[PDB]
Design a protein around this nucleic acid. Sequence first.
DNA 1: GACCTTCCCCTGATGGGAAGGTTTATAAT
DNA 2: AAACCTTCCCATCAGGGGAAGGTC
Lengths: 395, 1239, 99
Amino acid sequence: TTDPVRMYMREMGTVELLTREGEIDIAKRIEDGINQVQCSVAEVPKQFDYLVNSMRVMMDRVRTQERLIMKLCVEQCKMPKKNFITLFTGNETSDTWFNAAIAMNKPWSEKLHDVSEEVHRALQKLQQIEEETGLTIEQVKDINRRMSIGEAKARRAKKEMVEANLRLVISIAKKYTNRGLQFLDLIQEGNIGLMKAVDKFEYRRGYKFSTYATWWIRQAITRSIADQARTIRIPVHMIETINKLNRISRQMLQEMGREPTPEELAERMLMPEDKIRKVLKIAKEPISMETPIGDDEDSHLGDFIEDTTLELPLDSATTESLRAATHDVLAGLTAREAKVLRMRFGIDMNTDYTLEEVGKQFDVTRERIRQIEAKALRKLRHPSRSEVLRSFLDD
Amino acid sequence: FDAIKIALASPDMIRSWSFGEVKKPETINYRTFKPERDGLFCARIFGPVKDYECLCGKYKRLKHRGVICEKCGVEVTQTKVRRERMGHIELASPTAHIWFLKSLPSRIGLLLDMPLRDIERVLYFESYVVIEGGMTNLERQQILTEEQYLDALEEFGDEFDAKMGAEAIQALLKSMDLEQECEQLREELNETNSETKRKKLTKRIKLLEAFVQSGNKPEWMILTVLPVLPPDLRPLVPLDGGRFATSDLNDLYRRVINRNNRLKRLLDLAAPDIIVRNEKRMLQEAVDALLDNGRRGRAITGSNKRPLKSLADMIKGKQGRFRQNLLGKRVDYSGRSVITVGPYLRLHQCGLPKKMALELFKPFIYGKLELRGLATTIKAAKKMVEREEAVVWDILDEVIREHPVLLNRAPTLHRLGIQAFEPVLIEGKAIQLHPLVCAAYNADFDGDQMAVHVPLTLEAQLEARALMMSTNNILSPANGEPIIVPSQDVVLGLYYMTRDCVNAKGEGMVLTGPKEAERLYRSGLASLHARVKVRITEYEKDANGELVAKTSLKDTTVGRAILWMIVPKGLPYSIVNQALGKKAISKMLNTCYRILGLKPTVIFADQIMYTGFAYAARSGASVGIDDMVIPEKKHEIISEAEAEVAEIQEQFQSGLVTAGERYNKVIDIWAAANDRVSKAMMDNLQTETVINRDGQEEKQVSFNSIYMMADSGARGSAAQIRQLAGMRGLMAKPDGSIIETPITANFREGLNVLQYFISTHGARKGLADTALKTANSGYLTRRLVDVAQDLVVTEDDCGTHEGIMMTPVIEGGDVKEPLRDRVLGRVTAEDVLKPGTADILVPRNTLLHEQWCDLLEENSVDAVKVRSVVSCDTDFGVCAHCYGRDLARGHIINKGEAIGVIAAQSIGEPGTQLTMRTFHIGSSIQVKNKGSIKLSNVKSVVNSSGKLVITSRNTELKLIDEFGRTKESYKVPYGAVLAKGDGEQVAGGETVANWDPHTMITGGLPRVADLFEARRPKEPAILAEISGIVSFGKETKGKRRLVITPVDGSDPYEEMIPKWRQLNVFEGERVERGDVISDGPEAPHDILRLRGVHAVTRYIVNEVQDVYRLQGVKINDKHIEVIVRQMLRKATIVNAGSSDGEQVEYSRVKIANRELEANGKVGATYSRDLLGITKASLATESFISAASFQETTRVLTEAAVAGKRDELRGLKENVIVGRLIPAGTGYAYHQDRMRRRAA
Amino acid sequence: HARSTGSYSLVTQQPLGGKAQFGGQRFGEMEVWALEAYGAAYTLQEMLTVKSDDVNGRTKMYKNIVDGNHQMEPGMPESFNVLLKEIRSLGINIELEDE
DNA sequence: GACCTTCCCCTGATGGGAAGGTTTATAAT
DNA sequence: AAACCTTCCCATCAGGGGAAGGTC
Ligand SMILES: [Mg+2]
Ligand SMILES: [Zn+2]
Ligand SMILES: [Zn+2]
């Protein structure tokens, strides 16, 4: 075989199933890791995660000063790494370890004096934490180390947990296969819900993990279908409404004999009737432009589609002729009227202007302009000046 | 622009095109239908849906264009920009490009000289791979599985990196140092022999150095960023009514986006491996299905078992882009309709319906109406032509006047499938076609349809008058014979006129002139067939080109005198004194053209038609049931043969004869009886009419209607008559090919059920063969045009005496085609001398028109060395001289005329008249014609009998007649019986050849396809490599051994042959190179290598001409020669010359080697390489041209890694971009334009 | 049936084959070869540039025709730009040089 | 002349609602 | 499929004001 679905179906066989002791003891390992974390918090998961991240932030703050002082005293001053670790281990609070390293009197010992100025203030940042967190710079590190160990325990146990029950995900996903969504998409969206179930399962309730994992995976597959199946995405609740309508119209088949009257579904369903026709008009799916056409020939639906945005040249020629005709006509009037018409309208100009807009730079404001236009249009209303343009209006 | 280039796409260059990143696989809203943010149709990434309008609607006009509204991030511009704006998707994990992996020459495969299978294994996340090992137990590249890698990390935590998946392949391509690796393979090719060391090395080095030349980087094989196609290229446009219509590209992109997003989510979500590896494989699958679907798994569209069409499928194939769109398009200003006869037309005009004329010439009519003040503006003229006002009709007459239109028959086999005519407005909806042109189109009035095209530009109107005009094309380009010739009723009327019968009214009387003959017939006094003799004045221009009229009285008929009035002035009236059927109405037309010229001949043919139609009309020329006269002897003949078979029946029932013996016996006797019956009815028909001469009986050629139709050539031939009035032979099955129970009945008596059922057997194979052949002939002619296009006449003269020796095809007893026909129209390679040596009949090189042909024909000459296209000193084209002359016009071929396309057409048009299968049926020599025995290349000796015997295998038997020409050619095997010898005088058939019996394709159209493809025969004959006595081998080990024995110097050559193959060569005899040690069918490669270019270019033409000679097809050898030239355009160097086993174009090897040989430097020796038409077409400088014709994916991939460049330098690539093709008028324009360029 | 100027296909600008009398006649590779056999460069170019593709050329030629001027300003066939976009939609980079 | 009540336009104030997200425990591979 | 809950966006309603109308 070649397809990757086979590379997955036969790969998951290497991980053995777990029941029933396996469930409980791997869950106990998970809880033991998280319980290692719980004691480390001493010195709903939503706030718990912020607490964890705050400890991590404190350790990052300390490590920043660590690496800064290290780059300053090793890269910028050439002191050996051992001479830094030996003198820095134990205090990590005061400046007592810097003056001693100066008194060492090795060649690098002089460059410490210059970085002493730059390290003193970095140390004040590091020391202040003690007055905030009520701990020494070493206890922070130790607590973080132990809690990271707890995380590692939880991680190994949870990966094993999901790997063991992977098969149930396929067992659930094979039921839904044909909904415009490929198979591996279904099994993966189900694995996501399987993980979400693992992280939110109490092994102490005594129930079998199968049920909870089943619920979560079923939800994670159905909702995922609603999300990613149709090319035009539809609100999640609308897919539920469509499925309900289809279920009712399916059940009423043997009742009405052939099919139900549309007004009935509004009765059987909770919704008034005027929305049902919209819900049915919405469900139309796109047709591939490669769909074969009549005579079962090579012609396809992507061929018979014209372009209607384009304007036929028969009309563009008329547009140009009207351009020229109005150009010759406006020149027949006066210069004042010509400018007024080419201003109120966008003729031969950047943009159209309003009444006060035109009156602004014409030295006589609104009403004057209103009197010119109505006059010029009157002067052009007359035949023997409107024939060539009158040929353009046909209704 | 002036060129096109193709290269790899770097990730940064990919982002360069993109104007935004696609994040969500959404298209439109589902209630507003607007383009969602970051969706495939996003107006922020690509552009607004509406022209000069913003999505939010805040910015609405041309007032402000360049601005990005802070509301929705849209810039108000032209909506058409959604056609040009690309996008990009940021792939979470690297993904390999399918083309660079699945293509036959896997790029990544032999780029790291890794195998394809192992790369595929690594990509599926089924194993690891090492990269940059340095000082490690393992190499820099290797494979290991899960357990192996498990305990491998503890060995060396650092300095040892082994990845898995696409990231691993990419990193292997990145840290790879191409120069370092390359700098080794060179030496690996030099020292070590054993071509296995030279199989892929000599190609891998090429790949490396070309990769470095292009400048692109190998890491780009793995796509970091995925480019997207503009939305208007894959529209979701609403299909009305209601339902939407999308592109499968959209579904593929949606899948890709979904999977990349899920991968990102899982990455942030911190999921274990198995899940993410499955997701990586899903993403790779989606990408590969989006690029080239079907190579792996053929993902399917929802709601269908139909696969969704991917990107690569929108380019390759007859359907798709290249063939279906760029090389051919639906065209405006065109129409279609049913054609019908109007004979009243001239040869240059055709009847065009007024309804079609109004629609086609609409813009011209609008403009003309607006010009003359008849319409205020364009809309008014539109409404006028819409209203069918009378005034417009005159206007139509004004605009159609002298405006040629192109008429096209649905199938276009050759260029004559399209010809221009002068429109003649007619009522009705039927198109009127000129009869004389029907032969060119191959179109009947049985319902065939034709299309029309209106030339727009002035240049096109001139090209439709000087080039494609109906009158400017009369004689075919494939052969000099005119394609415009009276077909059925014309020749029938003329044959009725020129016919003569004794005792006709007024026979023997005399008339003042032809006018009186007409006045005598039309008055009812004299008939039209009388043997009257009248006075006629014939014109002959002589002795200085000065016309001199000649007056005299001749032996003629009234009808021939009437027909003489149409003949132009310059003809001799000996052309009009005979039966005057079709076969020489043709020759009359040809002589009129090649004497008086084009202008007289056009009106001559028009008058021939005008008169023949009316005369055949007033002649009656009907057909009745009594016109088919069966022979009264037929009964007795049939009964005799029928009884004859009973003896054979008794013979087999006993065992005296076998089943096959008796079957052949019966079939032979029945065939002979059929001969007898047909002969009886023919003798009762041809001399049927007998009447009284001056009062006493005499028998003459008959006036029988059907027989007149047979004799004139207007319609059905003698084979039709034999079945019309006699037993219609015996039928043939699909195979078995002949049945013992013949058809006793003739069509007139009527068939009985059994015989009709037997006939349907042969009827089916006939009908079926035509239908499926239609499909394959197109393929053949298409390959032919593909291998020939860019070849154009580019030079005046090449200056080479090489040419080819033209000798008549004297096969067996007589000649199949004289030398005049194989030499006429071409140019001599060297001065032909009179048969008396050292003289001059023709100068060094000159075009041999009909006059030199006649001069040669008078003098005893069957030897003329003719310059040919195959051997020509021209580069990238052919010069007018060596090609020779040909056209509708009979002068030397012009310059810039694209001859390759017309040659492909000349070979493809007759391809539809061929057949799919042959199924042939059918010993001292007897010389026929009186002459002199002339032996050729024979060693002989005298023996006991005293006469002469042949000691050589090859021995030709020529005949030097009393004139000196050679009309006999016979081959005699080893040990013959020679009665005269070389240079003797034979009687009227003295037998000089005697020996013993023993001592001991399809073919057709498929055959033609095989010859042009240089396909190896089934059981090839092998050829000797050098002169010398042959030598045998060790023993039969597998096949056998054969040792070459050169005589003088280097004599190490050898070969191995199977003992199952019989041998023919002599053992202790000298045998030159290119000799048949083994009987069999020869291969083009072997002939070329062991005989030379001219020998093989003659073999190809002589063999491919036999299948066309079998069927009544005649084409000048010139087109086949140009095709053969295009085949052998490649060659391989031997000595590497001054600069770099390689294969290159012959012209380039010359431009590089001969110019340096002039420079006094070392010469480079090449070896002609013979390729088929499709294979020779596979190799072309232009990559666009190659990617258009075939194998788009592979060609484009290879040209991409090569970074190759295309300046288009040619025909197909020019039509692809819509430019003037470099030929004809395009040649005249390109010459001036290119002269000023690059200089 | 006959047609001077009708509608055009969306993705590739070519006159539609329908519907159905107003479809533009098909000019296949064989007809292009027929135009190539004769030396007819302007006929072929206007056949595959002004009459089918070249969204600008159609309008230009129509206006010129209605003005009594019979001259073509040929542009780039739209199908070729579509092909360039499609090829560029891969890891392939195809461009055009100076002018 | 003021006073009491009346008749129409901007800030936003919001109940309304569509689109979106998280749970669901028998066991269920 | 249901079940109760949060973010965002409507297109409309209580509230204010700037004056406006009508009269013992
Ligand atoms: Mg027909
Ligand atoms: Zn906006
Ligand atoms: Zn030449």
